[PDB]
């Protein structure tokens, strides 16, 4: 895996003062043996906290170790929407290589806490011990468009919320994890993982 994540340069850039401070948590699965790991499909969940009724429009990048194999939905999507987006009537997961892009929209702030997105990933049979398969959530911008996490009306409040989400709600090169697994994998910019231990 690589660090596709970018620096949040929108304004405001500092989200600490935000009324809504959303945190995205990504599954961290650990196996004791290569044995139990190989061929297992892990449900990886992208779960949001502290934003019930506080967001509408969403869009962010997910990536994962190249050695994992995503199992698509019935319709070929790499991610399936979860309970948090059940009242957001627009949702889309666009496939993106060893990753997916996921985006939300709603007719009011009907964003909920809970699982935003589910991604089914599968481990190699060449599993090995101590292997660590990082799963990243990442912010990406350019002049044509950028990632989002705002309210129905992109209020001042909305943009502070968004700044939090990306700078502090998730992990990046500039808010690194200290997870013993993401360290052992120089993927401190990553957010969750599938892992196995040494002997």
């Amino acid at each position: 895996l690589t660090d596709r994540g970018m620096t949040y340069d929108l304004d405001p850039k500092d989200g600490s003062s935000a009324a809504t401070k959303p945190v995205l948590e990504v599954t961290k699965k650990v196996f004791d043996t290569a044995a139990d790991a190989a061929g297992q499909t892990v449900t990886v969940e992208f779960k949001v906290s502290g934003a019930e009724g506080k967001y509408a429009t969403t869009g962010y990048h997910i990536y994962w170790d190249e050695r994992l194999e995503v199992v698509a939905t019935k319709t070929g999507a790499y991610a399936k929407k979860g309970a948090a987006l059940e009242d957001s009537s627009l949702a889309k997961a666009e496939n993106n290589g060893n990753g997916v892009f996921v985006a939300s929209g709603a007719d009011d702030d009907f964003g909920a806490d809970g699982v935003m997105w589910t991604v089914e990933l599968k481990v190699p049979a060449d599993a090995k011990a101590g292997d660590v398969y990082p799963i990243d959530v990442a912010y990406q911008w350019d002049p044509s468009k950028g990632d989002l996490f705002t309210d129905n009306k992109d209020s001042a409040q909305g943009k502070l919320m968004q700044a939090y989400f990306f700078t502090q709600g998730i992990k990046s090169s500039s808010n690194p994890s200290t997870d013993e697994y993401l360290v052992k994998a120089n993927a401190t910019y990553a957010d969750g993982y599938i892992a196995i231990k040494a002997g």
Binding site: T57, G59, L90, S104, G105, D107, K145, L148
Partner: protein, 42 residues
């Protein structure tokens, strides 16, 4: 100026979607204004 850019910030992204989607939830229930009128009155 840019086809797709409902909110008119030079930029086509999910915010434009949410604008239309909310516009529809209003008209749907009995709003009479244009999209431009609705947008600006926020």
């Amino acid at each position: 100026d840019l086809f797709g850019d409902i909110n008119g910030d030079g930029i086509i992204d999910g915010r434009d979607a949410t604008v239309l989607l909310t516009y529809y939830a209003k008209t749907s229930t009995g709003y009479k204004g244009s999209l431009m009128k609705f947008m600006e009155e926020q």
